[PDB]
Design a protein around this ligand. Sequence first.
Ligand SMILES: Nc1ncnc(=O)[nH]1
Ligand SMILES: Nc1ncnc(=O)[nH]1
Ligand SMILES: [Zn+2]
Ligand SMILES: [Zn+2]
Lengths: 157, 158
Amino acid sequence: AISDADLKYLRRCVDLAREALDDGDEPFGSVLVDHTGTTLFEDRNRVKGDATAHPEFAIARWAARHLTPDRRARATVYTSGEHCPMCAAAHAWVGLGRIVYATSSAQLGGWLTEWGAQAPPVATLPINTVAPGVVVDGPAEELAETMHNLYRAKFGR
Amino acid sequence: AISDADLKYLRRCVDLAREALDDGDEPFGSVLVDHTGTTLFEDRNRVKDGDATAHPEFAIARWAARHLTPDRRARATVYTSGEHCPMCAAAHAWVGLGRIVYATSSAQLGGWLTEWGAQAPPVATLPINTVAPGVVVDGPAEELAETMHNLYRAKFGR
Ligand SMILES: Nc1ncnc(=O)[nH]1
Ligand SMILES: Nc1ncnc(=O)[nH]1
Ligand SMILES: [Zn+2]
Ligand SMILES: [Zn+2]
């Protein structure tokens, strides 16, 4: 179950990943959405400061800065690509709720290997390995090609 | 590979974890040190003020990228009272910092929390090398095990 509504948000994350790519950054987009449906915060990759400038992390801090603990747990975080261990840990520490992702990090690491790309210094661990009690849906089969192409644009070799 | 020199820094991290506790935070201290032996940055836990991600090992990771060069970062070592959590280990690896030395492991911490009937943290107690495979990791320090058991107990046994 990835709902027709979820898809709407994952597509938006993909738009944001595109946006990041066009500005010279890595293609990752993420979106914070309250239990109501109102979209509270949108972000994308900004590595062109530290290599840690991931949207999913920036949401985690925004979630702590402006929401109450009860709100956070009722929120959902959509993302173009599955949270990396930094981002999943952060999500769990601030006690955010659901995660939905369009491609897995399994998908991504496979494709990097295909392109002979530098295997990242952080392991492509599933979210549930890092944050065991988070509810996780993903990946989305409809967006797999789209993301494969997006990732290729930045990591193909 | 806990050298005498390393211990000096781990004791300093413990002092910092104590400073955090006293001020009403969780007892975690960490210290950034260049090859030269000059201590570039010191920090401790700051989660009371509101944010559960306010870990000193992460704050070093960002300080390391804003203020050093990549070659200096790999050159550097990060000491910590308690083994880096997955957030912090990942951050360390992303910014390409070098060695990590830790006084207690997370295996130690989780085993105590269970000993005290404490709630497990929402993030799993993964070794650093599970998250950041190519980081050089020394720790734990037998001399500081009792000290940290008691410190952790003070916050997480009550
Ligand atoms: N999941 C993830 N890995 C790497 N960079 C990111 O922005 N996100
Ligand atoms: N590693 C770690 N766990 C919890 N709090 C911290 O400041 N650090
Ligand atoms: Zn991440
Ligand atoms: Zn941490």
